[PDB]
Amino acid sequence: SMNPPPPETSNPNKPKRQTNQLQYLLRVVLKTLWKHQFAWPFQQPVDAVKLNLPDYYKIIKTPMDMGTIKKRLENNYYWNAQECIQDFNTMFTNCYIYNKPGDDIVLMAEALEKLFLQKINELPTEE
């Protein structure tokens, strides 16, 4: 029932890269989702205590959110685009795994994910 440590956003010994695909993921992909009217539930880690979801972290062992992804991009956590893409995908998957089909949060994740898929479809080729 208590909240876990948030996902890591800083790790100095992890090697880093700033690539055009990763720049696209911040400038285009993250910006689009972050400003969306349904972004708010996904803008920070699930606070299981305040939301009263004591089994959330019992079920979800790989939590992820756009707040975390935003810091990871802004502070250059990643080596490649696929890591960041996997984080976005994990965030959506967590939602569908934990919640019931047709809950509001699932509709929200579905709208965000649709946009995410359209942008990732136009991911530039690596420079």
Ligand SMILES: CCc1c(C(=O)NC)[nH]c(C)c1C(C)=O
């Ligand atoms: C419905 C509770 C919830 C929020 C939220 O309401 N955040 C403020 N965000 C997420 C990802 C969820 C779940 C359980 O998937």
